[PDB]
Amino acid sequence: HANINAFKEAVTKIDRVEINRRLELAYAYNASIAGPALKDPYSVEYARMLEVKEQIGHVIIPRINQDIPIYAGSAEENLQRGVGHLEGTSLPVGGESTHAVLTAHRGLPTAKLFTNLDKVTVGDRFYIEHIGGKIAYQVDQIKVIAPDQLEDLYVIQGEDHVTLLTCTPYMINSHRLLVRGKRIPYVEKTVQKD
Known part of the structure; x- marks a missing residue:
């Protein structure tokens, strides 16, 4: 996107002392490992430290050729221009005992978004870029759930996951699709051409 060059550009213009301070805030917030009730995003300023040009980072999913900005919250306004972050889950900056959940509509007219997330396979990887750099995940579990079930989205102590969440079956959306990566x-030697 043009929206993510503006992110990349503005990051380089930030003192590390500041970047560090901002990350320290993010980590400290991520001790929400030690906790209440997520709200299925389809029916704030919590991440301000991470917010640069309106975005908390971008996610890169090579198998499906996406590089999509991430916005805090699940507000429809933002879910129209990229990926939303599920408030109540860890901020996408990695760490022991973190589980960030990132969610996005399937096949929106403005953007494809997660429309092709069914084609990600256990073993594929995706990457998150944030103010502090780039972190990698390898998909370890894909699964299908009812919209009112959230056990899979909570923090798993001593582990470091990000879940990519969308609706499924395609064009039916009765259930949710959870593609989960392990840090x-x-x-x-990251490969994108493949």
Whole structure:
């Protein structure tokens, strides 16, 4: 997007001392490991530290060719221009005992968004870029649930996950699709051409 060059650009213009301070806030917030009730996003300023040019980062999902900005909250306004972050879950900055949940409409006219998330397979990876850098996840579990079930979205102590959440079956949307990655080391030698 044009929206994510503006993110990339503004990040380089920020003192590290500041970037650090902002990340410290994010981590401290992420001790919400030690806790109440998520709201299925389809029916704030909590992430301000991470917010740069309106965005908390972008997510890159090579299998499906997406690089999509991430916005705080699940407000429909934002769910029209990218990925929303499910308030109540960890902020997408990784860490032991974190589980960030990122959600996005399927096949919106303005953007494809997560429309093709059914084509991600356990083993594929995705990446999150935030003020502090880039972190990598390898998909370890794909599963299908009813909209009122949230056990899978809570923090799993001692582990580091991000879940990508959308509705399914395609064009039916009766249930939700959860593509979950497990943190791995970020290795340049990241491959996008494949």
